[model samples]
Target: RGSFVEMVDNLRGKSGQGYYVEMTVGSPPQTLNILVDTGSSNFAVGAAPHPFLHRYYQRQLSSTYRDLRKGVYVPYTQGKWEGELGTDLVSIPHGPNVTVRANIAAITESDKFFINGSNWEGILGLAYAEIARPDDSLEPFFDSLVKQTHVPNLFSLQLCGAGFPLNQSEVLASVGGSMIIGGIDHSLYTGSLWYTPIRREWYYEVIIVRVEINGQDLKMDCKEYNYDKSIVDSGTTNLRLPKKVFEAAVKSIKAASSTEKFPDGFWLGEQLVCWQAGTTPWNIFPVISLYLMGEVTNQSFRITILPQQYLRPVEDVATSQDDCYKFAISQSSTGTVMGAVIMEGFYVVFDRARKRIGFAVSACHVHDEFRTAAVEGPFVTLDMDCGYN
Candidate 1:
């Protein structure tokens, strides 16, 4: 027994930003769009009117909304919000078809958290309850759903918009893909699912064996790829690497590529690179590969992304008729983040029940001329303690 929810890409202003799904809350069921985030653990919604928000959850109107009399403050990497904790009847129309009494955060104030042109009014964090704020005692929405019902303790995501241009004339609000709760959708993926043991419960932490550029390893200490932690977060828009690891990766890509005239601002994601309108620059870049520790010791699996995934198109520049692109990888002070740039290439499964994450070629990611993303392995490795704490 499983359920699935349809997702919208929310690519109004930026590509590969966030995916959202419509869900209902309260007694008389007010529908709202929520962002799907695996890095966080709070089910937060806009409660007060804000300039950026088009709609909000009206707490006073919900007869069944009960105030827990507790405060919640959630701080993200680039944004934060303050809210009150409460209990509400929640139901996902496309999900399990069951109404659940779940913990909800009514966000009243925020800073840089909600941006203009975003279709989502809240966030649905799919991670474990350990990272739930104000404290772990507050069970997460997914956790409550599983406990209240007999659904399996796992879910999977398929984001279809890989290498999607940053700007377009038509606002593509939907067609992001689907989120399967309680089980995997075999039809959404190809080949076999590559499994990697979950290193930690908080934030879906995993271990990185190494990073490769053009099939060549960076050769740095494996630990550097996972300095503080390595996680797969759907909320993050791009692939992130530790400061040292990011530097090495950029250096490797620069050396492997034929052109060396690209500006420093381009690599820093501060400036865009443009070429003649009919031409493309993706062919000049090399493929990037990431190795993750498998479920067994000394075994690793490889996930690769073509240059098309990293060199994203920017269509908003109206001044020039040139085809512009933006770098989709950025430096992360907190270790690697396998965000949308990598995830959009494959189907990702968060198998919490088995304490492992799974990856397979997404059905939507197949390219006729060339493959965009791929997963292969259970390859033998020399390092057994690559995931060592």
Candidate 2:
């Protein structure tokens, strides 16, 4: 087996962002921390010096760097960047110990793509080549790795920073996780994996049959859950829902809570809620569940997140009076995005060769001897073709 594990560092502690892994690029290699993003398919690195970045890829010093004479522009929800296409020798020291010539996007200019205080120098796009910039013919880094190294066509991610306080000290602290390339790490998760068919290849797109709050359904059309697209993206920070679905979810969540008063901007992602230190008000919030279309016909698997996962804590700004927290769910115009907020609760397996994605309860999701997230059965369902187009 060509399987290897790459240690992943949680950027949430440092920049309130995604997880990243360290990799070496070029001959006389320079090590750089790269964000592991599955939402896009462009292996991009900051090549030019920027005020926000501590360092960039000095392509001039790389003896093996070759420019492809191509200009690539990639736009993201939070930022955008333009870069020159090139080829370089790359290897993940903690991953598979094989060097491969891979397509590299030397980012020359960017907007908010590289934020201040972030520790990453590049983004390792882990999606399919179908979404690769400059065209699908451009093979993604992972694709090339598999082709060159003959590793298994699968990968698994375990993000262990679920309940880390978003405080100054904790934010700058490093959290541990892992990315198992070419295989799954059974030890990282408990229970049998719940497999869901990948509806599309451009991204790890899956169909969400329905969403529930405290076991009550959102009472919307199944199609609305995946109105535009439903994807499992490690790059995104929160659990994003379609406009209509988001509204319904918010209403149901508020109705489920016994307390009538909520601070302004609580649901708008602007304000934070506070409680006494060492005490969490997770009980006040309702559990959220997502039903995903399973591989078996008319079967769906439910993954539920408790209040602790969504009610993110802000420990650094704690006053003697209170400890604060921020809401982790948000509205999205691009449909449902099962991001780190939900993924941190589960060990996610991207079984690309089998055209399916797997989810199992992460071992790290437990706190105080109780699991904060839960994954349930492949329950029989009425929607026979939930995601079929």
Candidate 3:
């Protein structure tokens, strides 16, 4: 049986709690464990009841729950459904110099953390999971904050994997992924955008009928293609390839490794194909084309991707199952194509109202804050072309 794991999770207790609130009370200091989520709209932790929320936070707060009356709490996402609400002063790294009071939802950490979620823990809601959602914080978080305060919620993400690029990768240090606040990254993409939305309520719901691989087109034998409408979340760390499409693409790539030398003089699975390192000095990412329409396509502009680190040299190929794990082609019945980990330091806008997701598609470059990004999400059934295939 083939099973697919959702890249992001909903609720839980904790072993490695990250959303801890810290503050200095005179000569002493304190902290609390919290939950951080990029897939949701609000940032919340556990807490006791409070007046600021002006609403009732429902949850058991006895031995079944952690009172954490000694702790602070704020009502953020759907009211931190943890303990009660309380306020404790805290600091945000690279945040403003002034310390602000935040909330801590009570969550009990038991031997079975996930099962024994006491009050609630900590929370950071600014990421995308290999999935999609309409109520993500991108809308609310930006709207309210921007209106009241001039302070912008700006942050940057740089993915530096072991033995990865020491130089070029995607960079969204400015603002763009959120609503309209700071400027977008203009240098990363080729142009601006055109869009359409995936019509569904399921997590990352989408449809697929065809795909265009590295400059080549492949027609699907299926009439109805089902796929999950996925999103570009920040916390996820891998490719969320749909099972059927993933298998087909890898089958093609592996065959090339065994019998065919890539037209670019590459022998698949050889030791010389280090996508982490480039054949040339400037490239850190590969170029590949993607077409998402079922019947509408222009063959002239079919070749979309331009991978700089695409073709691996003969020596860098790792065919063994162990070494190849890094290049493992995951399978999922739910269709999705997430270039999250592969294309770090990028920026994008998902206009659900418009039924579209936009990005800066300049080969390996992260989305150009100002360029024309593409609207490619799920074309699982059509069988996409990974140039290597």
Candidate 4:
């Protein structure tokens, strides 16, 4: 596969589990950390401030930079960014190869995006051209990569949770996953890949045929509220469930059922449901399995989430606290947003050209073959004239 494995931050005290890659813009290469978002289709950089005080894209620095002077607005369910939309020579450091250029959506102004001291500078959308803003009509970075380089038509993500007792040298510390573009790696995952057809092309939207907790299928009316709609997203940490499904899952948890309904611990002052770290019986807890629309009508692929993976401890800052463990929260956030928690256990393949998504149990192991494969294949050298007007 033609790809590069970039480290992602999954540390505690951060907003949620997100996969980010180091990318630079312009000739001087204004280095930036971008969150890889499969749910959206746009490439944006900060006009920088707060948190990334000096990291913002200084348009004047790049000799290839051009000013389009057009305004655009990119919106999300919980947040949105409205700013000057333009393109530039974007470069991602994929090992020892020389840099390449692509037309990207350079965000100049935004109020309610990922601005709260986040390590990432902006978000990179991995969806299709149909989802990009109509006004800007800018080609996303991935599309440009395909058009300009000899890369594969798809990308693979191996999302793993950052466990306790962080180790900087091990390379997995606070790391959630790695992305392989143009090809897939067998070392990062094990077993056969279960492919689920994308019901909607806009966001890798899959049909949730069924959801079970600890072998018991929770009674839910999928038709009434359309709970079947599931958006696979690495940008979000918690698995936001439907109203009925959320309440049902919470009530099943012995810790939260009778207690305050919401755990009384403070992590960034947001009330999250949690249990005492090292003491909670997360292993004995329920195993969540979600069934997606399979190749055939009656066919479905299963995605299971173990307790150890879900009962995550809030990390980075407030680690000394005893009550640190937590689980997926429910708040009708989106039509059941399947975030990094459920994704980490599986090797996810987003085959956009085929219009399908693949998931399998992840081995979560790094191998020598994969490292060699990473360097040998899936290399895309883009020939660019810095085509952003």
C-alpha lDDT score of every prediction, in listed order: 0.81, 0.80, 0.32, 0.62
TM-score of each: 0.93, 0.93, 0.46, 0.80
After superposition, the stretches of candidate 1 with alpha carbons farther than 4 Å from their true spots are 1-16, 166-169, 319-321, 366-368
Task: Give the range of the ten consecutive residues with the poorest summed lDDT in model 4.
Answer: 370-379
TM-score for candidate 1, residues paired by index: 0.93
Task: Judging by lDDT, tell me the better candidate of 2 and 3.
Answer: 2
Angstrom error of the Cα, residue 322, model 3: value is 16
Pairs of residues at least 3 apart in sequence or in different chains that clash in candidate 1: none
- Candidate 1 residues 1-389, lDDT tens each? 12232422222223444777788999799998888888889999999999988889998999999999999887777989999999999998777668999999999999998867667899998898888998899999999999999888998888766344533334344466778877787778888899998998999899888788988989988888888899999888789999999999999998988474788999998788887875775666888888888887678898888876677667646687787778889999987888876777788999999999999988766243654678988779546455536
Clashing residue pairs in candidate 2 (N, C-alpha, C atoms within 3 angstroms): 13-171, 167-316
**What is candidate 2's local distance difference test score?**
0.80
Error of 3 at 354 (Å): 5.9
Per-residue alpha-carbon lDDT of candidate 3 for residues 21-52, written as tens digits (9 for 90 to 100): 22221112333333333344333443333432
Over 4 Å off in model 2, which ranges?
A: 1-15, 166-173, 315-321, 366-371
**What would the TM-score be for candidate 2 when compared with the true structure?**
0.93
Error of 1 at 9 (Å): 9.8
